[PDB]
Amino acid sequence: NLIKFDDQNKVFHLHNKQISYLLSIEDGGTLSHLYFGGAVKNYNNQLKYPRLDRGFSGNLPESLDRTFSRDSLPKEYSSAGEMDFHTPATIVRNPDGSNALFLAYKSYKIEDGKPDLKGLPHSWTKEDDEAQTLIVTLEDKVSKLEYDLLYTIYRDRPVIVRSVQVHNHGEEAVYLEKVASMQMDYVDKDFEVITLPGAHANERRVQRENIGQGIKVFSSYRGTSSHQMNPFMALVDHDTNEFMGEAYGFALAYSGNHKFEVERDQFGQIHVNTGINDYNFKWKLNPNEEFQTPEVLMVYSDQGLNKMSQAFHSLIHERIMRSKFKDQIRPVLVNNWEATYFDFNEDKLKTIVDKAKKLGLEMFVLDDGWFGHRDDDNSSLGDWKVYKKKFPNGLGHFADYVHEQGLKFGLWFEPEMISYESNLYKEHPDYLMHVPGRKPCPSRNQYVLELGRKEVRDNIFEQMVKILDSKKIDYIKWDMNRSLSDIYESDLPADQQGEAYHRYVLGYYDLLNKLVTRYPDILFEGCSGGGGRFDVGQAYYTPQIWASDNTDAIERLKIQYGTSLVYPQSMMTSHVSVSPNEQNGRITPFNTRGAVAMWGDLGYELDLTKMSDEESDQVVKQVTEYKKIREVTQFGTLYRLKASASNQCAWMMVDSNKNEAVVTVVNVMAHAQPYCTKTKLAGLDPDKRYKNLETDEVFGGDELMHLGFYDPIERGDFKAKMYHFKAIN
Amino acid sequence: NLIKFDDQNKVFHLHNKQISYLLSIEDGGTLSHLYFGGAVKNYNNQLKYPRLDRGFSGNLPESLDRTFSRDSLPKEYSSAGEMDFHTPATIVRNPDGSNALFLAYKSYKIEDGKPDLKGLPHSWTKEDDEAQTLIVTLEDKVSKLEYDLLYTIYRDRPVIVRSVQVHNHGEEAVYLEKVASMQMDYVDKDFEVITLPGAHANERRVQRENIGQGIKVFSSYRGTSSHQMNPFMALVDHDTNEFMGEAYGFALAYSGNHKFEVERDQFGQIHVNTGINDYNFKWKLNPNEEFQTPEVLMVYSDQGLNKMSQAFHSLIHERIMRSKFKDQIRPVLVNNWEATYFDFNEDKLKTIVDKAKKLGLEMFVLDDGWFGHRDDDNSSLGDWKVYKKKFPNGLGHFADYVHEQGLKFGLWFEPEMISYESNLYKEHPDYLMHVPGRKPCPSRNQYVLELGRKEVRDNIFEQMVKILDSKKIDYIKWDMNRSLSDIYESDLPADQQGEAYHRYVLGYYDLLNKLVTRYPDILFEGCSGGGGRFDVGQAYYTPQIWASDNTDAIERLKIQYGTSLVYPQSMMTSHVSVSPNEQNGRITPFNTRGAVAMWGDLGYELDLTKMSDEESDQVVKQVTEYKKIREVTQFGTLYRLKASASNQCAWMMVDSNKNEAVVTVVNVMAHAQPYCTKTKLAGLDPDKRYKNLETDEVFGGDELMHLGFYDPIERGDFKAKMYHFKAIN
Amino acid sequence: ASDNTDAIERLKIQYGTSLVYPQSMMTSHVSVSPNEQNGRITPFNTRGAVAMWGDLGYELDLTKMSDEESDQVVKQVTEYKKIREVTQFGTLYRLKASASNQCAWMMVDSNKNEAVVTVVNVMAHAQPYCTKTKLAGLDPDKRYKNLETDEVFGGDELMHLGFYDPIERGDFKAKMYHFKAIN
Amino acid sequence: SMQMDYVDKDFEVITLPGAHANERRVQRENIGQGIKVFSSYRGTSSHQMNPFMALVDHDTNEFMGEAYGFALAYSGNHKFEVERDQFGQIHVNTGINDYNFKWKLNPNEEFQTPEVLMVYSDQGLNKMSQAFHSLIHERIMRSKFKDQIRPVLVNNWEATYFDFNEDKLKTIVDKAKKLGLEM
């Protein structure tokens, strides 16, 4: 069906209408990568790697053929100790102290659908016939280890999904010092690389570079996927842009330490690994045990980055996210954090609720400060019980009030964290993650829990169900405000402390899965001081994620633009916040804040009771208009049109039948002598006729995409305009 | 004089007329990097790092101050487990299984001269007073480790030399999983990075790149400094070129596995480590032991890359090389490898000696094939006794014949290597480096010796002195023709197998040092399939090195150009070889091979007896000319003028008093309609008057550097011209 | 120099004008905000600092200024009279071009005893990169007192080390420095 | 007014294009084969293209590298031509634009062109600019005021446009006086 093995020339071919993926069994049972790209009907050996004696690239054991080398062949995988000098995909530590591993082809099987990954988020299928998986097994006969390489192709997607499962069939333990989820080697490709670096309050700007000889590394070891480097990269041709050219995307489905490596070697070849970062990673694999890596989603586009991005959005939204809310319009909420910070009580919050109701908002979210005795960020983490001074009648009483006003109710937690000045720390001080005999380093004056221990998770779990069993909470904002610095797990032997990072993430997933599974009618929004854990693995549990603590309309342009490179727009949230902006002091028009916050799932995060009449009227109009378009903005096909470095940022959504489109154009710097700009649309049907619903003028889809229209000329920095088109009969 | 500590502001200042280097003791005893660059007389706290609370950049143990972080401060050093998220300079494994180290300032001392590095090559002083060394001690009071950071400054050079010595003052062992020789952090610099990648027969092309957010790694783990990536890196301004702009050069004095890391972080700062590669590196440091790293040479130029390169040339030549030959003109020799390969006997070689004498050559080097039963490269490594079939009366009989013809005699060895097909292997099979139980991988159908074992080194040492004590050998070419792939040392415990790479190099150095020390009157030429081990460390033992097995005049332009970026031209050798070229098939003029080969130390490597009469005449003239100019070409100050991607490559040497200059200009591709080009000189005295010794015309130095001269126009590819100027009274 | 009197677009106009023409040849006025030609909003102090690069003037209805703006004018005028000999006639060095997100320049009197430096930041950032400003045109062996802080630095320090620019929130912000050689 | 031909130079060209309310941004380009023309025929030297050009090495910046500056001393139509030819040589003309220029020169008459100032810097654009500043200020400008501090003036144009009378201007004058303005 989708996957065939030609036993004549030892070539595996994964194939659908859009893509072909070819790999083969070369000399020494070496698994060789041939091709990933546009579909071909057949293969006829034209990509067999040329034989050449290359100085200092050595050969297979006992071989006299100097023209074949594992140091030059493009491959599907690699290891330390096989006469390869590229950065290896896997590294094993053997009882004799060596790091040797020499993998050779053993067998394969082809099966329908794709197997569940134990303890990890993963992509899946609705019907078994919609995908197939190839599992190629390699073995080292001396250490008796077997590596299963998994490859999944979906029938209807330009996607290959890969991961690795290691098995110890020997009599002694080994340690896994590194296990990449995949490796891909290219020949005669002159790619550029695109990644999404950033910082707190500055996530995921698009960065794009040449690849020189050596290794470029994009990674995190913060215990999280991180603000500073998203687990994603794309390889593109020099000329690829948003609308044309080839692109290969690689998204790692994992929310902890990642490592993407892009190496160009001495023969001009590009070698790529992705998976769990090997930094302090050393997994003890006992006899008869197995280790499963997270998976990587790989997308090929033959036609620009929007098309690449759209394939990620569709896969994530349709075959990764489990939430019952994933296909449901998301509520327009007010969140009180920037509005009040810690300085509030119930009565203060009730006036905000009352104002939210008059403005037509749909949900009120209670943010940090409701619990323990949290008056500031120096205490109380670990004590998930209401702070009575602020809620004298309990939380249920406030929740009832919110519901009474026609609003849903949301609540913030930070389940992974603990403060010295908490009841939790006084009763269970060993729950705090640290190295015994060493003072731990603080970050935001708090510390991290040992989520690798069941007892620790059970305690936090029980605290939480005590609040959530009332079913008065409709939504949970799950936050996480520091990286891991003191890496240890107190109940493991010394020789297993290389497991602490990954066991932390497994425990996080386990606790999280337990809560979203127990409360399927709760909308969970992920958060980590903004977008510090914004990845495909997280999507599996939370259908939306706070993109950034930076709520400036202008800096949000670059953050939402970069985020959309991988993640569907319904997965990121965006709030209208006060001006001057609280993080950078920028002054922006209220209407621009609105229009930028409608790209993600719209909400409000400012003190609504302090808005002028004029601002309130604008909120009324924004919310009324958003309710009419949000099915299209939240779930339509997304096209990036213009990137902010150009002084304009523009994007649009089109519904799946191309009958309706919503376009936004934002101008950054004003100029006294402005150049005329045009905006051209994308993704319309050239033979439909579209009415501009503001002006009632009608335009062929062909006109909107080829002619476009003039952006209106106006004075003032930071101005936006929106357009709404609908196909007529 | 050169080093001061201000104990009130806690600032160390190393200073001479050219450079200043500033570092301070910051909060928490954190050693902070302030500045390295043009000299300043005083310092007044203006570079104190700004305090800002940065999200997810955590703080010191027990500190309430969030505006200071080891994750944002620029530093002299760093480690895993100190709340820093950059790639760490050092990583330690403790008995409790953790990788935590927390270093804090302990004390300093300032000494004259600089201390010897045990078991390693290093720079040194002739008079104590020409340099001073600052040693800053940092400690971790829990593990009781102490790290000594050494900083040496020479009075008359724009150089800082750095290394690290780790001491275990606790009661239990630790393991060192990484120990960088140096770290340097920069603020608000938008550098490009230059490196010297290549391949076998394609070494050290200049590569130049932008630095994006993430980590760029330039490294080797071939057990040698390598063909693929030289242990060198420079950081430069975007507008820096050969003649102007700032440049920072870093050369690691080490001939094993290296790793240069250049990270640009989330706050736009650039973070650099250099040292021994941490790949499979794990050094067990028992109580009361120490570990010394190789040193790094750092050069600052405020005026282009020529001036940076010249500071390295001068340091290497005057204060690193130890050979009695280092200041002596190098012989014009013939080497028979490309002339005959393996297919020769004594009588064939004698005709070549005879022709060499007629042509005025000064030395004959007997290359591979003279020993064991070496008829091809499938046997005999490890059997260093003459091959009686080829030398029926012994090696001394041939050596004597060479001397009778008035030439010196050189001999090739590959002391680090072993063939299965050898007496060495038959008698001592366990000398062969391999993981017990695993067939080793072959490369050039040979294997590596366990140089980490005294027994093994002594065996080879004794074989070699038996030949060399005859006093009949004036020169040794020391070759090494494959990388290390099966990494183990049979006499170490399993938990010390992470010492195998570094013990191998230490053993190599130990054997090499012993031999060069016993034979001060022998000229040693290093080699490793060409330039696979061309580094500052090797220079300490061998004053010249075979630059590449590529002997094509045109590809050698790029190899020699990139080589000269760090290494004095007297350290590289270059031979006129046959056309068509044996490696790439290019056809070049005999004159062009001559001119390109006089940049390095000139030699011939082709069957002299087969040359036409016209070529013999060219050789006679080349050799007669070279003897006149070679004091200037071999030891004069070097200036690169034009790089070959321009279609021209040009360079010149000027003697120390600027009275004599030799210039070479090579045109690569001809054109039917050629543009006129000019060549301008550099490094002359503008107020001297220089006679062109071919034409007798006289030009002011100012004219030669400002006006230059037209290059002659000719047809034909791959043509060269040389000029020789001398100052007149 | 231009009918455009926006402090921010004036950075590029004044920068390109100075490529050829002495600064005393161009005039620059403090004008109202929002700017009348492009609608940009800028701090009053930034308009002052950019308008002192050329020969300073005011072009706005002085009778409509708030008391706070009038005090700023009094202070701008008082400061400008002290320094204008150097800013109008000192040797001009451009230091930073606005596309870098900063525009900076400085004037040094003919004996290198006095210098006036201006640094203007265009876009604010939530997560700002530290920047330094290095001076040019000073005597490396003179010692120069910052007249605001009273701290003293060698000419060599000010040109090779420079100093950290202060980190502030808000778009379109300026800082000036006045150095004078001491005995 | 002049012509300059270069051999084996791989210059970039800097010019000062703009528009009304947007004059003299720095622009910097490669020179390909063909002719690049920078000019005015507005009867003035113009907002759109200042009569100035510099040729610089690729690595030249504000502080280092060679630069050649060419300023045409003329306030009418100019034309700067930078031609790179079929043999890689660079040919430059500067003078009065020839566009609808046709001057009848009778027997025994003469025609004098405006002059071009050419500056060579061996050390960056600041140094080039400083030489233009010094020449223009000391050897071109004739005005008695050229060496005198320039007055801090208020100009009423953006303050009132056309809508004023004397009484209104007098209130602005009074306020200007309180603020310490001089004209």
Q: Do residues A607 and A481 share a domain? A: yes
A264-296 as b/e: b if 16+ CB within 10 A = bbbbebbbbbbbbbbbbbbbbbeeeeebbbbbb
Q: How far apart are CA A524 and CA A413, in angstroms?
A: 11
Q: How far apart are CA A229 and CA A204, in angstroms?
A: 7
Residue tagged 């007044």 (tokens): B44
End-to-end CA distance of chain D: 40
Q: What is the resolution of this structure in A?
A: 2.3
Q: E strands of A128-282, at which residues?
A: 131-140, 145-154, 159-168, 174-186, 192-195, 207-210, 214-219, 232-236, 247-252, 258-264, 270-276
Q: Which of A114, A124, A120 is nearest to A254 (CA)?
A: A120
Q: Do residues B279 and B289 share a domain? A: yes
Q: Which of B367, B399, B330, B364 is nearest to B542 (CA)?
A: B330
SS3 letters for A107-129?
A: EEEEEECCCCCCCCCCCCCCCHH
Asked if A550 reaches chain C (Cβ–Cβ under 8 Å), the answer is: yes
Q: E strands of B169-319, at which residues?
A: 174-186, 192-195, 207-210, 214-219, 232-236, 247-252, 258-264, 270-276, 283-285, 290-292, 296-301
Q: Residue A232: give its domain's CATH number.
A: 2.70.98.60
User: Which 153-182 residues of chain C touch chain D by CB within 8 A?
Assistant: none
Q: Which of D57, D58, D47 is nearest to D16 (CA)?
A: D47
Backbone angles phi, psi at A337, to 5 degrees: -55, -60
DSSP-derived 3-state class of residue A16: coil
Q: How far apart are CA A369 and CA A342, in angstroms?
A: 5
The residue of chain C nearest to residue A672, with distances taken between CA atoms, is C38
Q: Which of A410, A370, A342 is nearest to A575 (CA)?
A: A410
| Structure token pair of residue A573 | 């949230």
Q: Which residues contact A154 (CB under 8 A, 6 or more apart)?
A: A16, A125, A130, A131, A315, A319
Q: How far apart are CA A453 and CA A466, in angstroms?
A: 21
Report the number of distinct structural domains present in chain A: 3
End-to-end CA distance of chain A: 41
Interface touch C160/B38, C-beta < 8 Å: yes
Residues in chain D: 183
Q: In DSSP terms, which residues pair with A654 in a beta bridge?
A: A637, A661
Q: Do residues A651 and A590 share a domain? A: no
The 10 Å Cβ neighbour count of residue A643 is 18
Interface touch C157/B188, C-beta < 8 Å: no
Catalytic sites of A, residue numbers: 479, 549
Contact C17, D23 (CB under 8 A): yes
User: Which 205-234 residues of chain B touch chain A by CB within 8 A?
Assistant: 207, 209-210, 212-222, 227-229
Using an 8 Å CB-CB cutoff, list chain D residues near A713: none
Using an 8 Å CB-CB cutoff, list chain B residues near D90: none
End of a domain among B266, B282, B310? B310
Interface touch B676/D7, C-beta < 8 Å: yes
Q: How far apart are CA B601 and CA B445, in angstroms?
A: 31
- C139 class by beta-carbon count within 10 Å (0-12 exposed, 13-18 middle, 19+ buried): middle
Contact A202, C126 (CB under 8 A): yes
Asked if D2 reaches chain A (Cβ–Cβ under 8 Å), the answer is: no
Q: Which of the 8 DSSP states describes residue A245?
A: B
Q: How far apart are CA C7 and CA A486, in angstroms?
A: 49
Q: How large is the greatest C-alpha to C-alpha distance in chain C, in angstroms?
A: 49
Establish whether A480 is an annotated binding residue: yes
Q: In DSSP terms, which residues pair with B114 in a beta bridge?
A: none
Using an 8 Å CB-CB cutoff, list chain A residues near C126: 201-202, 549-550, 552, 555, 581, 583-584
Q: How far apart are CA B366 and CA B371, in angstroms?
A: 11
> What is the DSSP code string of A75-110?
BS--BTTSS--SPPSEEEE-TTS------EEEEEEE
Contact A726, A629 (CB under 8 A): no
Q: How far apart are CA A88 and CA A80, in angstroms?
A: 6
| Structure token pair of residue C90 | 């000192």
A607-626 as b/e: b if 16+ CB within 10 A = bbeebeeebeebbeebbeeb
Q: Which of D134, A277, D92, A174 is nearest to C24 (CA)?
A: D134
* Helix and strand numbers, DSSP H then E, in chain D: 3, 10
Torsional sign, CA B701, B677, B640, B663: negative
Q: Which of the 8 DSSP states describes residue B16?
A: -
SS3 letters for A323-346?
A: CCCCCCCCCCEEECHHHHCCCCCH
Q: Which residues contact A653 (CB under 8 A, 6 or more apart)?
A: A569, A632, A633, A635, A636, A637, A638, A639, A661, A662
Asked if A670 reaches chain C (Cβ–Cβ under 8 Å), the answer is: yes
Q: In DSSP terms, which residues pair with A491 in a beta bridge?
A: none
Q: How far apart are CA A125 and CA B388, in angstroms?
A: 74
B645, B669, B675, C98 from B672: Cα distances, Å = 19, 10, 10, 46
Q: Do residues B56 and B145 share a domain? A: yes
Instruction: Give partners of B (≥3 CB pairs < 8 A).
Output: A, C, D
Q: How far apart are CA B255 and CA A58, in angstroms?
A: 20
Q: Do residues A21 and A86 share a domain? A: yes
- B51 class by beta-carbon count within 10 Å (0-12 exposed, 13-18 middle, 19+ buried): middle
Q: Do residues B621 and B665 share a domain? A: no
Chain centroid to CA B581: how far?
27
A97, B178, D18, D49, D78 from D42: Cα distances, Å = 83, 70, 14, 10, 10
Q: Do residues B495 and B585 share a domain? A: yes
Residues in chain C: 183
Residue A180 one-letter amino acid: A
Backbone angles phi, psi at B646, to 5 degrees: -75, -5
Choose from D22, D24, D46, D158 for mutation: most chain A CBs within 10 A: D22
Q: E strands of chain D, at which residues?
A: 2-6, 12-15, 27-30, 34-39, 52-56, 67-72, 78-84, 90-96, 116-121, 153-154
| Structure token pair of residue B661 | 């200059």
Q: Which of B570, B637, B558 is nearest to B306 (CA)?
A: B637
Backbone angles phi, psi at A663, to 5 degrees: -120, 140
The 10 Å Cβ neighbour count of residue A258 is 27
Residue A521 one-letter amino acid: D
Q: In DSSP terms, which residues pair with B138 in a beta bridge?
A: B105, B147
Q: Residue B405: give its domain's CATH number.
A: 3.20.20.70
Q: Do residues A317 and A302 share a domain? A: no
Q: How far apart are CA C129 and CA D41, in angstroms?
A: 46
Residue B142 one-letter amino acid: V
Using an 8 Å CB-CB cutoff, list chain A residues near D19: 673
| Structure token pair of residue A639 | 């096209």
Asked if D20 reaches chain C (Cβ–Cβ under 8 Å), the answer is: yes
DSSP-derived 3-state class of residue A654: strand
Q: Do residues B625 and B638 share a domain? A: no
Q: Residue A716: give its domain's CATH number.
A: 2.60.40.1180
C78-113 as b/e: b if 16+ CB within 10 A = eebeebbebbbbbbbbbbbbbeebbbbbbbbbeebb
Interface touch A717/C124, C-beta < 8 Å: no
C-alpha torsion angle, residues B680, B686, B689, B693 (rounded to 10): -30
A373, A436, A514, B512 from A423: Cα distances, Å = 10, 21, 24, 66
Interface touch B244/D64, C-beta < 8 Å: yes
Torsional sign, CA A24, A30, A31, A33: negative
Establish whether C3 is an annotated binding residue: yes
End of a domain among B284, B310, B336? B310
Q: Do residues A369 and A509 share a domain? A: yes
Q: How far apart are CA B429 and CA B485, in angstroms?
A: 18
Q: Which residues contact B614 (CB under 8 A, 6 or more apart)?
A: none
Backbone angles phi, psi at A292, to 5 degrees: -105, 125
Q: Which of B158, B103, B112, B106 is nearest to B131 (CA)?
A: B112
Contact B73, B23 (CB under 8 A): no
Contact B608, B360 (CB under 8 A): no
The verdict on whether omega for the bond into residue C34 sits within 30 degrees of 0, i.e. cis, is yes
| Structure token pair of residue D135 | 């020449």
What method did the depositors use to determine the structure? X-ray
The residue of chain D nearest to residue A674, with distances taken between CA atoms, is D22
Interface touch A716/C39, C-beta < 8 Å: yes
- Domain of residue A579 covers 311-633
Instruction: Give partners of D (≥3 CB pairs < 8 A).
Output: A, B, C
Q: In DSSP terms, which residues pair with D182 in a beta bridge?
A: none
Q: How far apart are CA B232 and CA B247, in angstroms?
A: 13
C15-43 as b/e: b if 16+ CB within 10 A = bbbbbbbbbbbbbbbbbbbebbbbbbebb
End of a domain among B288, B310, B332? B310
Establish whether A479 is an annotated binding residue: yes
Residue A119 one-letter amino acid: G
Asked if A717 reaches chain C (Cβ–Cβ under 8 Å), the answer is: yes
A459, B330, B412 from B408: Cα distances, Å = 84, 12, 14
Contact B264, B270 (CB under 8 A): yes
Torsional sign, CA A458, A462, A465, A467: negative
Angle at which helix A553-564 crosses helix A590-597, to 10 degrees, equals 10
Q: How far apart are CA B149 and CA B161, in angstroms?
A: 11
| Structure token pair of residue A356 | 């939210």
Residue tagged 């004044």 (tokens): C14
> What is the DSSP code string of B588-615?
--HHHHHHHHTTSEEEEES-GGG--HHH
DSSP-derived 3-state class of residue A165: strand
Q: How far apart are CA B454 and CA B565, in angstroms?
A: 37
Interface touch C74/D179, C-beta < 8 Å: yes
Q: Do residues A415 and A551 share a domain? A: yes
The 10 Å Cβ neighbour count of residue B480 is 21
- Going by their DSSP bridges, the two strands A174-186 and A270-276 should be labelled as antiparallel
SS3 letters for A530-561?
A: EECCCCHHHHCCCCEEECECCCCHHHHHHHHH
Contact B615, B590 (CB under 8 A): yes
Q: Do residues A71 and A166 share a domain? A: yes
Indicate the residue of D54, D125, D175 with minimum beta-carbon distance to C62: D175
Give kind and range of the element (H or E) at residue B567.
Answer: none
What order of strands is seen across the sheet that includes strand A19-26? A3-6, A11-15, A19-26, A30-38
Backbone angles phi, psi at B389, to 5 degrees: -55, -35
Asked if D124 reaches chain B (Cβ–Cβ under 8 Å), the answer is: no
Backbone angles phi, psi at A504, to 5 degrees: -55, -50
